[PDB]
Tab-separated table of all heavy atoms in Angstrom:
chain	number	residue	atom	x	y	z
A	1	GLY	N	9.720	-10.927	-1.740
A	1	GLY	CA	8.721	-11.835	-1.317
A	1	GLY	C	7.908	-11.191	-0.189
A	1	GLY	O	8.348	-10.157	0.358
A	2	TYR	N	6.779	-11.775	0.099
A	2	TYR	CA	5.869	-11.153	1.148
A	2	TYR	C	5.052	-12.231	1.816
A	2	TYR	O	4.761	-13.307	1.272
A	2	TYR	CB	4.971	-10.058	0.536
A	2	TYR	CG	4.029	-10.513	-0.548
A	2	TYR	CD1	2.728	-10.975	-0.212
A	2	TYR	CD2	4.441	-10.514	-1.887
A	2	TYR	CE1	1.903	-11.401	-1.201
A	2	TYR	CE2	3.563	-10.995	-2.874
A	2	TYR	CZ	2.292	-11.409	-2.508
A	2	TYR	OH	1.437	-11.888	-3.467
A	3	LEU	N	4.591	-11.872	3.005
A	3	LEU	CA	3.660	-12.789	3.734
A	3	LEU	C	2.646	-11.858	4.404
A	3	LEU	O	2.981	-10.871	5.081
A	3	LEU	CB	4.369	-13.607	4.762
A	3	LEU	CG	3.438	-14.689	5.396
A	3	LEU	CD1	4.244	-15.947	5.767
A	3	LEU	CD2	2.698	-14.174	6.627
A	4	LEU	N	1.333	-12.233	4.243
A	4	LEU	CA	0.216	-11.536	4.748
A	4	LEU	C	-0.652	-12.521	5.443
A	4	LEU	O	-0.994	-13.508	4.930
A	4	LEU	CB	-0.511	-10.843	3.590
A	4	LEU	CG	-1.983	-10.504	3.758
A	4	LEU	CD1	-2.091	-9.453	4.841
A	4	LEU	CD2	-2.546	-10.021	2.450
A	5	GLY	N	-1.065	-12.178	6.775
A	5	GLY	CA	-1.812	-13.143	7.462
A	5	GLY	C	-2.619	-12.510	8.553
A	5	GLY	O	-2.382	-11.473	9.057
A	6	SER	N	-3.696	-13.296	8.940
A	6	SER	CA	-4.425	-12.933	10.122
A	6	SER	C	-4.359	-14.121	11.101
A	6	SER	O	-4.331	-15.330	10.657
A	6	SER	CB	-5.912	-12.640	9.783
A	6	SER	OG	-6.498	-13.766	9.227
A	7	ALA	N	-4.478	-13.817	12.363
A	7	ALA	CA	-4.497	-14.809	13.454
A	7	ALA	C	-5.337	-14.319	14.580
A	7	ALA	O	-5.577	-13.134	14.736
A	7	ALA	CB	-3.058	-15.108	13.924
B	1	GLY	N	-7.014	-18.491	10.784
B	1	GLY	CA	-6.994	-17.304	10.112
B	1	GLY	C	-6.633	-17.516	8.603
B	1	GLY	O	-6.645	-18.605	8.082
B	2	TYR	N	-6.293	-16.381	7.934
B	2	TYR	CA	-6.024	-16.366	6.498
B	2	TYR	C	-4.504	-16.107	6.265
B	2	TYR	O	-3.892	-15.448	7.056
B	2	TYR	CB	-6.802	-15.223	5.875
B	2	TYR	CG	-8.330	-15.297	5.942
B	2	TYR	CD1	-9.139	-14.276	6.371
B	2	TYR	CD2	-8.987	-16.480	5.557
B	2	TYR	CE1	-10.520	-14.380	6.381
B	2	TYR	CE2	-10.353	-16.645	5.575
B	2	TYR	CZ	-11.147	-15.550	6.017
B	2	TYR	OH	-12.497	-15.696	6.092
B	3	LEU	N	-4.021	-16.672	5.161
B	3	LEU	CA	-2.635	-16.591	4.807
B	3	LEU	C	-2.484	-16.406	3.317
B	3	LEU	O	-3.127	-17.060	2.529
B	3	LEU	CB	-1.950	-17.883	5.153
B	3	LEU	CG	-0.545	-18.145	4.662
B	3	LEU	CD1	0.382	-17.093	5.224
B	3	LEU	CD2	-0.043	-19.540	5.036
B	4	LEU	N	-1.605	-15.448	2.927
B	4	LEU	CA	-1.062	-15.407	1.598
B	4	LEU	C	0.375	-15.109	1.646
B	4	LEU	O	0.809	-14.134	2.278
B	4	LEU	CB	-1.784	-14.349	0.718
B	4	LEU	CG	-1.084	-13.962	-0.599
B	4	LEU	CD1	-1.004	-15.153	-1.560
B	4	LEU	CD2	-1.751	-12.725	-1.243
B	5	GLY	N	1.253	-15.983	1.036
B	5	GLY	CA	2.653	-15.697	0.946
B	5	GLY	C	3.128	-15.987	-0.470
B	5	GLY	O	2.545	-16.781	-1.171
B	6	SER	N	4.224	-15.285	-0.848
B	6	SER	CA	4.771	-15.430	-2.164
B	6	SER	C	6.272	-15.135	-2.120
B	6	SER	O	6.690	-14.143	-1.420
B	6	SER	CB	4.089	-14.524	-3.177
B	6	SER	OG	4.701	-14.624	-4.477
B	7	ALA	N	7.064	-15.887	-2.860
B	7	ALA	CA	8.507	-15.616	-3.014
B	7	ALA	C	9.011	-16.224	-4.309
B	7	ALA	O	8.223	-16.753	-5.114
B	7	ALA	CB	9.262	-16.106	-1.872
C	1	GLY	N	2.648	-20.182	14.327
C	1	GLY	CA	2.702	-18.875	13.627
C	1	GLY	C	3.010	-19.045	12.130
C	1	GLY	O	3.020	-20.167	11.621
C	2	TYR	N	3.346	-17.959	11.445
C	2	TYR	CA	3.587	-17.895	10.032
C	2	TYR	C	5.070	-17.746	9.835
C	2	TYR	O	5.761	-17.011	10.542
C	2	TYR	CB	2.809	-16.793	9.348
C	2	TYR	CG	1.303	-16.903	9.474
C	2	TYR	CD1	0.464	-15.848	9.881
C	2	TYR	CD2	0.671	-18.134	9.079
C	2	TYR	CE1	-0.883	-15.938	9.939
C	2	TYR	CE2	-0.726	-18.219	9.116
C	2	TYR	CZ	-1.476	-17.155	9.523
C	2	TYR	OH	-2.847	-17.206	9.583
C	3	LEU	N	5.566	-18.273	8.724
C	3	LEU	CA	6.936	-18.154	8.318
C	3	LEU	C	7.165	-17.980	6.833
C	3	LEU	O	6.526	-18.678	6.030
C	3	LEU	CB	7.682	-19.496	8.735
C	3	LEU	CG	9.136	-19.699	8.265
C	3	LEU	CD1	10.008	-18.723	8.796
C	3	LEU	CD2	9.594	-21.099	8.546
C	4	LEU	N	8.059	-17.032	6.428
C	4	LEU	CA	8.565	-16.987	5.091
C	4	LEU	C	10.051	-16.694	5.208
C	4	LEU	O	10.444	-15.771	5.815
C	4	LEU	CB	7.868	-15.916	4.238
C	4	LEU	CG	8.562	-15.573	2.927
C	4	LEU	CD1	8.580	-16.746	1.955
C	4	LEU	CD2	7.880	-14.349	2.228
C	5	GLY	N	10.852	-17.591	4.547
C	5	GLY	CA	12.284	-17.267	4.433
C	5	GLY	C	12.771	-17.555	3.056
C	5	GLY	O	12.240	-18.356	2.350
C	6	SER	N	13.840	-16.887	2.689
C	6	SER	CA	14.425	-17.072	1.371
C	6	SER	C	15.911	-16.686	1.401
C	6	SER	O	16.311	-15.783	2.076
C	6	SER	CB	13.731	-16.118	0.371
C	6	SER	OG	14.348	-16.224	-0.893
C	7	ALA	N	16.680	-17.502	0.683
C	7	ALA	CA	18.122	-17.218	0.545
C	7	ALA	C	18.658	-17.792	-0.789
C	7	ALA	O	17.869	-18.375	-1.545
C	7	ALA	CB	18.873	-17.692	1.712
D	1	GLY	N	19.376	-12.509	1.798
D	1	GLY	CA	18.359	-13.409	2.245
D	1	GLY	C	17.509	-12.776	3.333
D	1	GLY	O	17.967	-11.785	3.876
D	2	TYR	N	16.393	-13.304	3.627
D	2	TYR	CA	15.544	-12.772	4.650
D	2	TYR	C	14.665	-13.818	5.326
D	2	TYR	O	14.428	-14.859	4.802
D	2	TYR	CB	14.645	-11.662	4.025
D	2	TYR	CG	13.663	-12.127	2.973
D	2	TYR	CD1	12.459	-12.580	3.298
D	2	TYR	CD2	14.099	-12.131	1.680
D	2	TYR	CE1	11.577	-13.015	2.323
D	2	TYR	CE2	13.222	-12.586	0.683
D	2	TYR	CZ	11.963	-12.984	1.045
D	2	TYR	OH	11.032	-13.466	0.056
D	3	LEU	N	14.246	-13.472	6.533
D	3	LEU	CA	13.302	-14.324	7.262
D	3	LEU	C	12.276	-13.477	7.930
D	3	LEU	O	12.607	-12.437	8.594
D	3	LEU	CB	13.986	-15.218	8.310
D	3	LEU	CG	13.106	-16.272	8.955
D	3	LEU	CD1	13.904	-17.496	9.273
D	3	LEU	CD2	12.329	-15.788	10.155
D	4	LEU	N	10.977	-13.827	7.787
D	4	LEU	CA	9.890	-13.083	8.265
D	4	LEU	C	8.983	-14.081	8.974
D	4	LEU	O	8.652	-15.100	8.480
D	4	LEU	CB	9.145	-12.460	7.127
D	4	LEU	CG	7.647	-12.146	7.304
D	4	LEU	CD1	7.512	-11.008	8.377
D	4	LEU	CD2	7.082	-11.606	5.951
D	5	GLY	N	8.576	-13.784	10.280
D	5	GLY	CA	7.812	-14.760	10.977
D	5	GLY	C	6.994	-14.123	12.092
D	5	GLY	O	7.237	-13.056	12.622
D	6	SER	N	5.957	-14.863	12.425
D	6	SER	CA	5.189	-14.565	13.653
D	6	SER	C	5.263	-15.739	14.638
D	6	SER	O	5.310	-16.943	14.214
D	6	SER	CB	3.760	-14.237	13.323
D	6	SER	OG	3.068	-15.362	12.711
D	7	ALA	N	5.131	-15.411	15.883
D	7	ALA	CA	5.171	-16.418	16.975
D	7	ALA	C	4.308	-15.982	18.123
D	7	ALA	O	4.069	-14.738	18.256
D	7	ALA	CB	6.582	-16.701	17.438
E	1	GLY	N	-3.731	-11.110	15.664
E	1	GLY	CA	-3.643	-9.863	14.935
E	1	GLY	C	-3.336	-10.061	13.479
E	1	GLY	O	-3.369	-11.158	12.953
E	2	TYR	N	-3.049	-8.955	12.782
E	2	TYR	CA	-2.770	-8.889	11.381
E	2	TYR	C	-1.272	-8.673	11.149
E	2	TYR	O	-0.596	-8.038	11.905
E	2	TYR	CB	-3.587	-7.798	10.733
E	2	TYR	CG	-5.087	-7.894	10.826
E	2	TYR	CD1	-5.829	-6.861	11.256
E	2	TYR	CD2	-5.713	-9.087	10.400
E	2	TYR	CE1	-7.207	-6.988	11.289
E	2	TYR	CE2	-7.106	-9.197	10.484
E	2	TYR	CZ	-7.851	-8.144	10.923
E	2	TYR	OH	-9.247	-8.230	10.917
E	3	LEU	N	-0.713	-9.239	10.051
E	3	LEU	CA	0.626	-9.145	9.664
E	3	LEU	C	0.808	-8.946	8.182
E	3	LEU	O	0.150	-9.642	7.381
E	3	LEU	CB	1.336	-10.430	10.060
E	3	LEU	CG	2.760	-10.673	9.564
E	3	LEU	CD1	3.657	-9.666	10.129
E	3	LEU	CD2	3.204	-12.115	9.927
E	4	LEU	N	1.677	-8.066	7.757
E	4	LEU	CA	2.197	-7.961	6.413
E	4	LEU	C	3.705	-7.688	6.529
E	4	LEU	O	4.100	-6.710	7.166
E	4	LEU	CB	1.513	-6.865	5.627
E	4	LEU	CG	2.236	-6.557	4.257
E	4	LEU	CD1	2.283	-7.710	3.325
E	4	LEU	CD2	1.499	-5.352	3.615
E	5	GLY	N	4.520	-8.528	5.898
E	5	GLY	CA	5.918	-8.242	5.811
E	5	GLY	C	6.419	-8.529	4.439
E	5	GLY	O	5.861	-9.354	3.714
E	6	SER	N	7.502	-7.900	4.007
E	6	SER	CA	8.061	-8.019	2.731
E	6	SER	C	9.527	-7.701	2.752
E	6	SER	O	9.954	-6.737	3.442
E	6	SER	CB	7.383	-7.123	1.710
E	6	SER	OG	7.973	-7.182	0.416
E	7	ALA	N	10.330	-8.487	2.037
E	7	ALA	CA	11.744	-8.176	1.912
E	7	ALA	C	12.290	-8.777	0.571
E	7	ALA	O	11.509	-9.292	-0.232
E	7	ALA	CB	12.534	-8.686	3.090
F	1	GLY	N	5.893	-12.732	19.229
F	1	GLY	CA	5.971	-11.429	18.498
F	1	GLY	C	6.293	-11.642	16.995
F	1	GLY	O	6.211	-12.772	16.510
F	2	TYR	N	6.611	-10.571	16.331
F	2	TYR	CA	6.880	-10.481	14.871
F	2	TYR	C	8.381	-10.311	14.702
F	2	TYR	O	9.027	-9.615	15.409
F	2	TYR	CB	6.061	-9.393	14.274
F	2	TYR	CG	4.582	-9.541	14.305
F	2	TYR	CD1	3.780	-8.453	14.778
F	2	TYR	CD2	3.910	-10.683	13.966
F	2	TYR	CE1	2.382	-8.554	14.804
F	2	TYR	CE2	2.495	-10.811	13.981
F	2	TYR	CZ	1.784	-9.737	14.418
F	2	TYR	OH	0.451	-9.905	14.431
F	3	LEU	N	8.835	-10.869	13.549
F	3	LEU	CA	10.263	-10.739	13.232
F	3	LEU	C	10.417	-10.566	11.684
F	3	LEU	O	9.792	-11.217	10.926
F	3	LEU	CB	10.934	-12.084	13.605
F	3	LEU	CG	12.383	-12.326	13.064
F	3	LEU	CD1	13.281	-11.270	13.628
F	3	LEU	CD2	12.840	-13.690	13.474
F	4	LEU	N	11.318	-9.623	11.326
F	4	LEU	CA	11.808	-9.603	9.964
F	4	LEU	C	13.332	-9.278	10.041
F	4	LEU	O	13.709	-8.312	10.657
F	4	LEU	CB	11.161	-8.493	9.114
F	4	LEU	CG	11.833	-8.168	7.787
F	4	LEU	CD1	11.840	-9.297	6.844
F	4	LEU	CD2	11.140	-6.896	7.171
F	5	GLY	N	14.173	-10.140	9.441
F	5	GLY	CA	15.580	-9.910	9.351
F	5	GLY	C	16.024	-10.136	7.958
F	5	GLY	O	15.461	-10.917	7.233
F	6	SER	N	17.119	-9.444	7.544
F	6	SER	CA	17.705	-9.624	6.232
F	6	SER	C	19.171	-9.293	6.259
F	6	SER	O	19.566	-8.306	6.952
F	6	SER	CB	16.977	-8.740	5.196
F	6	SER	OG	17.596	-8.807	3.983
F	7	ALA	N	19.970	-10.067	5.549
F	7	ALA	CA	21.361	-9.752	5.425
F	7	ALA	C	21.886	-10.391	4.112
F	7	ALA	O	21.157	-10.935	3.281
F	7	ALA	CB	22.182	-10.271	6.591
G	1	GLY	N	12.956	-3.478	3.165
G	1	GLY	CA	11.953	-4.374	3.635
G	1	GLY	C	11.210	-3.760	4.626
G	1	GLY	O	11.537	-2.747	5.196
G	2	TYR	N	10.022	-4.313	5.028
G	2	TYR	CA	9.160	-3.716	6.019
G	2	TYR	C	8.351	-4.821	6.670
G	2	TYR	O	8.039	-5.870	6.104
G	2	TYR	CB	8.283	-2.632	5.399
G	2	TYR	CG	7.365	-3.109	4.329
G	2	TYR	CD1	6.039	-3.569	4.636
G	2	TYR	CD2	7.733	-3.138	2.966
G	2	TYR	CE1	5.146	-3.976	3.693
G	2	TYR	CE2	6.844	-3.580	2.031
G	2	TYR	CZ	5.588	-4.037	2.342
G	2	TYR	OH	4.688	-4.503	1.417
G	3	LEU	N	7.827	-4.460	7.916
G	3	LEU	CA	6.948	-5.299	8.638
G	3	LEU	C	5.898	-4.425	9.263
G	3	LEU	O	6.238	-3.458	9.930
G	3	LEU	CB	7.652	-6.188	9.652
G	3	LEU	CG	6.731	-7.222	10.227
G	3	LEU	CD1	7.516	-8.502	10.596
G	3	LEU	CD2	5.983	-6.777	11.554
G	4	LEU	N	4.627	-4.862	9.138
G	4	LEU	CA	3.490	-4.130	9.651
G	4	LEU	C	2.597	-5.119	10.354
G	4	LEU	O	2.296	-6.111	9.793
G	4	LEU	CB	2.753	-3.443	8.465
G	4	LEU	CG	1.282	-3.081	8.652
G	4	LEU	CD1	1.143	-2.032	9.682
G	4	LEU	CD2	0.697	-2.630	7.340
G	5	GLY	N	2.234	-4.793	11.553
G	5	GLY	CA	1.445	-5.713	12.342
G	5	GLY	C	0.608	-5.164	13.471
G	5	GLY	O	0.879	-4.028	13.944
G	6	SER	N	-0.405	-5.855	13.837
G	6	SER	CA	-1.179	-5.562	15.002
G	6	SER	C	-1.093	-6.751	15.971
G	6	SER	O	-1.021	-7.894	15.525
G	6	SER	CB	-2.666	-5.249	14.697
G	6	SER	OG	-3.285	-6.352	14.107
G	7	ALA	N	-1.214	-6.429	17.208
G	7	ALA	CA	-1.206	-7.393	18.321
G	7	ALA	C	-2.078	-6.897	19.455
G	7	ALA	O	-2.276	-5.675	19.634
G	7	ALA	CB	0.216	-7.657	18.803
H	1	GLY	N	22.657	-5.063	6.670
H	1	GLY	CA	21.604	-6.003	7.125
H	1	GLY	C	20.777	-5.367	8.202
H	1	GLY	O	21.212	-4.341	8.766
H	2	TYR	N	19.667	-5.927	8.502
H	2	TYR	CA	18.809	-5.315	9.514
H	2	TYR	C	17.953	-6.459	10.184
H	2	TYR	O	17.711	-7.482	9.701
H	2	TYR	CB	17.942	-4.210	8.944
H	2	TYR	CG	16.984	-4.661	7.858
H	2	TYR	CD1	15.702	-5.154	8.153
H	2	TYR	CD2	17.343	-4.710	6.519
H	2	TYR	CE1	14.815	-5.604	7.230
H	2	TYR	CE2	16.474	-5.179	5.531
H	2	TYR	CZ	15.190	-5.575	5.895
H	2	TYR	OH	14.362	-6.047	4.891
H	3	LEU	N	17.496	-6.073	11.390
H	3	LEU	CA	16.542	-6.939	12.159
H	3	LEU	C	15.529	-6.014	12.811
H	3	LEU	O	15.866	-5.030	13.457
H	3	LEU	CB	17.293	-7.795	13.186
H	3	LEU	CG	16.357	-8.850	13.788
H	3	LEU	CD1	17.167	-10.080	14.095
H	3	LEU	CD2	15.597	-8.422	15.010
H	4	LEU	N	14.257	-6.412	12.653
H	4	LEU	CA	13.148	-5.717	13.184
H	4	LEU	C	12.295	-6.690	13.879
H	4	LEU	O	11.959	-7.716	13.308
H	4	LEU	CB	12.431	-5.025	12.007
H	4	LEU	CG	10.941	-4.664	12.204
H	4	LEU	CD1	10.841	-3.608	13.219
H	4	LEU	CD2	10.356	-4.220	10.834
H	5	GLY	N	11.902	-6.349	15.103
H	5	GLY	CA	11.074	-7.319	15.852
H	5	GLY	C	10.228	-6.676	16.958
H	5	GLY	O	10.492	-5.658	17.503
H	6	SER	N	9.195	-7.414	17.294
H	6	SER	CA	8.455	-7.137	18.506
H	6	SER	C	8.521	-8.333	19.501
H	6	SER	O	8.558	-9.493	19.070
H	6	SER	CB	7.017	-6.833	18.222
H	6	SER	OG	6.380	-7.972	17.589
H	7	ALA	N	8.405	-7.997	20.748
H	7	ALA	CA	8.469	-9.007	21.846
H	7	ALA	C	7.585	-8.534	22.975
H	7	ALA	O	7.374	-7.313	23.131
H	7	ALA	CB	9.858	-9.245	22.329
């Protein structure tokens, strides 16, 4: 699984 | 922000 | 924040 | 299992 | 900032 | 901060 | 597994 | 198992 994000 | 997650 | 967990 | 996070 | 994690 | 753990 | 980030 | 983090 993976998670990709900007903040 | 932007988010993409998958599992 | 962002979270992804799996079990 | 796994856990991925930002804070 | 930016984040990518995978497991 | 950022976290990834797995076991 | 891996984690890549900027802060 | 492993743990990877920033603080």
Side-chain angles (χ1 to χ4, degrees):
Chain A
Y2 62 89
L3 190 149
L4 156 65
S6 61
Chain B
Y2 296 131
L3 169 63
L4 166 63
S6 177
Chain C
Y2 296 131
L3 169 63
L4 166 63
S6 177
Chain D
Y2 62 89
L3 190 149
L4 156 65
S6 61
Chain E
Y2 296 131
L3 169 63
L4 166 63
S6 177
Chain F
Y2 296 131
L3 169 63
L4 166 63
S6 177
Chain G
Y2 62 89
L3 190 149
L4 156 65
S6 61
Chain H
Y2 62 89
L3 190 149
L4 156 65
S6 61

